[PDB]
Amino acid sequence: LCSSDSGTSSGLLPSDRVLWIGDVACQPMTPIPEETFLELKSFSQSEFPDI
Amino acid sequence: CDEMVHADSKLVSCRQGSGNMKECVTTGRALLPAVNPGQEACLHFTAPGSPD
Protein backbone atom coordinates (compact mmCIF):
# COMPACT_ATOMS: atom_id res chain seq x y z
CA LEU A 1 0.00 0.00 0.00
CA CYS A 2 1.29 3.43 -1.05
CA SER A 3 0.62 6.40 1.23
CA SER A 4 -0.14 9.99 0.26
CA ASP A 5 2.10 12.65 1.79
CA SER A 6 3.19 16.17 0.87
CA GLY A 7 6.59 15.75 2.52
CA THR A 8 7.92 14.39 -0.78
CA SER A 9 6.71 17.27 -2.98
CA SER A 10 10.30 18.30 -3.66
CA GLY A 11 11.94 15.98 -6.16
CA LEU A 12 15.29 16.05 -4.35
CA LEU A 13 16.22 12.67 -2.90
CA PRO A 14 19.58 10.87 -2.61
CA SER A 15 18.36 7.50 -3.92
CA ASP A 16 15.73 7.66 -1.17
CA ARG A 17 13.09 6.37 -3.59
CA VAL A 18 15.69 4.31 -5.50
CA LEU A 19 16.72 1.27 -3.47
CA TRP A 20 17.88 -1.78 -5.41
CA ILE A 21 17.88 -5.37 -4.16
CA GLY A 22 20.62 -7.81 -5.06
CA ASP A 23 24.17 -7.43 -6.35
CA VAL A 24 24.10 -8.15 -10.08
CA ALA A 25 26.72 -7.81 -12.81
CA CYS A 26 25.73 -7.61 -16.48
CA GLN A 27 27.61 -7.62 -19.78
CA PRO A 28 27.24 -8.40 -23.50
CA MET A 29 26.98 -12.13 -23.99
CA THR A 30 27.15 -14.83 -26.66
CA PRO A 31 24.55 -17.60 -26.30
CA ILE A 32 24.90 -21.37 -25.88
CA PRO A 33 23.11 -24.16 -27.78
CA GLU A 34 19.73 -25.31 -26.51
CA GLU A 35 21.05 -28.67 -25.29
CA THR A 36 23.74 -26.98 -23.19
CA PHE A 37 20.90 -25.10 -21.49
CA LEU A 38 19.12 -28.40 -20.84
CA GLU A 39 22.22 -29.80 -19.13
CA LEU A 40 22.26 -26.99 -16.56
CA LYS A 41 18.54 -27.28 -15.85
CA SER A 42 18.73 -30.99 -14.98
CA PHE A 43 21.92 -30.64 -12.94
CA SER A 44 20.40 -27.87 -10.84
CA GLN A 45 17.52 -30.22 -10.03
CA SER A 46 19.86 -32.91 -8.70
CA GLU A 47 21.89 -30.62 -6.45
CA PHE A 48 18.82 -29.35 -4.52
CA PRO A 49 16.88 -32.50 -3.60
CA ASP A 50 14.71 -30.62 -1.11
CA ILE A 51 13.68 -27.71 -3.33
CA CYS B 1 33.41 -55.03 -22.83
CA ASP B 2 33.89 -58.32 -20.99
CA GLU B 3 33.31 -57.06 -17.44
CA MET B 4 29.98 -55.28 -17.15
CA VAL B 5 27.91 -54.08 -14.20
CA HIS B 6 24.43 -52.58 -14.38
CA ALA B 7 23.29 -49.57 -12.38
CA ASP B 8 21.01 -49.56 -9.31
CA SER B 9 17.94 -47.84 -10.76
CA LYS B 10 15.99 -48.10 -7.50
CA LEU B 11 16.38 -44.32 -7.31
CA VAL B 12 13.33 -43.45 -9.43
CA SER B 13 12.25 -39.90 -10.22
CA CYS B 14 11.27 -39.26 -13.84
CA ARG B 15 9.20 -36.30 -15.07
CA GLN B 16 7.06 -36.96 -18.14
CA GLY B 17 8.06 -33.82 -19.99
CA SER B 18 7.31 -35.53 -23.31
CA GLY B 19 5.05 -38.50 -23.95
CA ASN B 20 6.78 -39.99 -26.99
CA MET B 21 10.19 -40.07 -25.29
CA LYS B 22 10.50 -39.96 -21.51
CA GLU B 23 12.94 -38.06 -19.30
CA CYS B 24 14.56 -38.86 -15.97
CA VAL B 25 17.25 -37.58 -13.60
CA THR B 26 19.15 -39.88 -11.23
CA THR B 27 22.40 -40.36 -9.32
CA GLY B 28 24.10 -42.90 -7.10
CA ARG B 29 27.29 -44.88 -6.55
CA ALA B 30 28.79 -47.82 -8.41
CA LEU B 31 31.54 -50.42 -7.97
CA LEU B 32 32.87 -51.87 -11.22
CA PRO B 33 35.95 -54.13 -11.37
CA ALA B 34 39.08 -52.99 -13.15
CA VAL B 35 39.30 -54.10 -16.77
CA ASN B 36 42.45 -55.38 -18.44
CA PRO B 37 44.53 -52.75 -20.27
CA GLY B 38 43.65 -52.05 -23.89
CA GLN B 39 39.94 -52.79 -23.37
CA GLU B 40 36.90 -50.76 -22.33
CA ALA B 41 34.48 -51.35 -19.47
CA CYS B 42 30.73 -50.74 -19.61
CA LEU B 43 27.96 -49.49 -17.35
CA HIS B 44 24.33 -50.33 -18.08
CA PHE B 45 21.41 -48.00 -17.39
CA THR B 46 17.89 -49.27 -16.76
CA ALA B 47 14.48 -47.63 -16.64
CA PRO B 48 11.15 -49.02 -15.40
CA GLY B 49 9.86 -48.61 -18.94
CA SER B 50 10.97 -51.24 -21.42
CA PRO B 51 11.96 -49.91 -24.85
CA ASP B 52 14.73 -47.37 -24.15
Closest by CA to B30, choosing from B14, B1, B7, B48, is B7
Mutate to test the interface with B, among A46, A47, A48, A51 (most CBs of B within 10 A): A46
B25/A45 Cβ within 8 A: yes
b/e burial code for range B4-30 (CB count within 10 A of at least 16 → b): eeeeeeeeeeeeeeeeeeeebeeeeee
- Number of H helices and E strands in chain B, helices first, is 0, 0
Residues on chain B touching A42 (C-beta within 8 angstroms): 25
A45 touches chain B (CB under 8 A): yes
Q: CB–CB of B14/B45 below 8 Å? A: no
What is the C-alpha separation between B20 and B2, in angstroms, rounded? 33
Q: Using CA atoms, how far apart are residues A13 and A42, in angstroms rounded to an integer?
A: 45
Name the helix (H) or strand (E) containing A17: none
Say yes or no: B34 contacts chain A, CB-CB below 8 A.
Answer: no
What is the widest separation between alpha-carbon atoms in chain A? 55
Query: In chain A, where do the E strands start and end?
Result: none
At A4, the amino acid letter reads S
> Which experimental method was this entry solved with?
cryo-EM
Helix ranges restricted to H, chain B = none
User: Is A42 in Cβ contact with B27 (below 8 Å)?
Assistant: no
Contact residues on chain A for B27, CB-CB shorter than 8 A = 46
